[PDB]
């Protein structure tokens, strides 16, 4: 189990270790070494998702480990409350950034091993604290640097608790 202790409340997450093995191992290693502590939710788009895990408060990007292979063909779908990996346009490029689906985003699911079909790998799900996720999706956002939909006031993951 993982808990995100944020400055808007606690979010409790269950991982799908069995369905996304490398992705969950990568996510938990960042969690266990303190990588997500003092990290923000840098991209908030109401009616779509909230994304975090890459930047500290003044949009300072943190150093990541090597990218992981896309495990999206695992039967899990981008439904409301699930966590999936963000990445670049290459399929096997995810490192530490994740997003939480705040609605069902079926357009993000795997449909084939191709640049447009690979989709986004679901690896976890919110079991407690979705009211907290719904407070964050509705915050006022703007532009920071070349980043759009950045919260005007920082939404910070202060600490992460990893429990079995």
UniProtKB/Swiss-Prot annotation:
One cellular-component annotation, GO: cytosol
GO biological process: chaperone-mediated protein folding
PPIase cyclophilin-type domain boundaries: 1-162
Keywords assigned: Cytoplasm, Isomerase, Rotamase
Subcellular location, record wording: Cytoplasm
E.C. numbers: 5.2.1.8
Activity regulation behaviour: Inhibition by cyclosporin A with a Ki of 25 to 50 mu-mol, a concentration 1000-fold higher than that required for eukaryotic PPIases.
InterPro entries: Cyclophilin-like_dom_sf (IPR029000), Cyclophilin-type_PPIase (IPR024936), Cyclophilin-type_PPIase_CS (IPR020892), Cyclophilin-type_PPIase_dom (IPR002130), E_coli_cyclophilin_A-like (IPR044665)
UniProt-recorded Gene Ontology molecular function terms: peptidyl-prolyl cis-trans isomerase activity
Superkingdom: Bacteria
One Pfam family it belongs to: Pro_isomerase
Stated family: Belongs to the cyclophilin-type PPIase family.
Function recorded in the entry: PPIases accelerate the folding of proteins. It catalyzes the cis-trans isomerization of proline imidic peptide bonds in oligopeptides.
Protein's UniProt name: Peptidyl-prolyl cis-trans isomerase B
Species: Escherichia coli (strain K12)
Gene: ppiB
């Amino acid at each position: 189990m993982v808990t995100f202790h944020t400055n808007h409340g606690d979010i409790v997450i269950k991982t799908f270790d069995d369905k996304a093995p490398e992705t969950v191992k990568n996510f938990l290693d960042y969690c266990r070494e303190g990588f997500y502590n003092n990290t923000i939710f840098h991209r908030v788009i109401n009616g779509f998702m909230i994304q975090g895990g890459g930047f500290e408060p003044g949009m300072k990007q943190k150093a990541t480990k090597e990218p992981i292979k896309n495990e999206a063909n695992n039967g899990l779908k981008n439904t409301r409350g699930t966590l999936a990996m963000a990445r670049t346009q290459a399929p096997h490029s995810a490192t530490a950034q994740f997003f939480i689906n705040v609605v069902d985003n079926d357009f993000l699911n795997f449909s084939g091993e191709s640049l447009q079909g690979w989709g986004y790998c679901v690896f976890a799900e919110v079991v407690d604290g979705m009211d907290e996720v719904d407070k964050i999706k509705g915050v006022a956002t703007g532009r920071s640097g070349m980043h759009q939909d950045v919260p005007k006031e920082d939404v910070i993951i202060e600490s992460v608790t990893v429990s079995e």
